[PDB]
Amino acid sequence: SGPNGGVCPVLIYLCRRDSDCPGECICLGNGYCG
Numbered sequence: 001s002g003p004n005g006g007v008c009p010v011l012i013y014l015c016r017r018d019s020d021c022p023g024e025c026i027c028l029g030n031g032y033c034g
Contacts, residue, residue: 001034002026008033
Protein backbone atom coordinates (compact mmCIF):
# COMPACT_ATOMS: atom_id res chain seq x y z
CA SER A 1 0.00 0.00 0.00
CA GLY A 2 1.20 3.49 -0.73
CA PRO A 3 0.02 6.94 0.37
CA ASN A 4 -2.89 6.99 -2.07
CA GLY A 5 -6.54 6.11 -2.26
CA GLY A 6 -7.61 3.22 -4.40
CA VAL A 7 -7.26 -0.48 -3.82
CA CYS A 8 -4.19 -2.61 -3.13
CA PRO A 9 -4.71 -6.29 -2.24
CA VAL A 10 -2.79 -7.58 0.77
CA LEU A 11 -0.41 -10.12 -0.69
CA ILE A 12 3.21 -11.02 -1.50
CA TYR A 13 3.89 -9.83 -5.07
CA LEU A 14 7.31 -9.16 -6.58
CA CYS A 15 7.87 -5.95 -8.51
CA ARG A 16 10.54 -3.79 -10.13
CA ARG A 17 8.53 -0.52 -10.29
CA ASP A 18 5.06 0.66 -9.30
CA SER A 19 3.49 -0.29 -12.64
CA ASP A 20 4.28 -3.98 -12.05
CA CYS A 21 1.94 -4.05 -9.06
CA PRO A 22 -1.83 -4.49 -9.35
CA GLY A 23 -4.29 -1.76 -8.50
CA GLU A 24 -2.84 1.33 -6.90
CA CYS A 25 -0.16 -0.55 -4.98
CA ILE A 26 3.35 0.88 -5.02
CA CYS A 27 6.60 -1.06 -5.29
CA LEU A 28 8.70 -0.77 -2.14
CA GLY A 29 12.43 -0.14 -2.46
CA ASN A 30 13.23 -3.86 -2.08
CA GLY A 31 10.94 -5.15 -4.84
CA TYR A 32 7.67 -6.00 -3.10
CA CYS A 33 4.27 -4.45 -3.63
CA GLY A 34 2.64 -2.57 -0.80
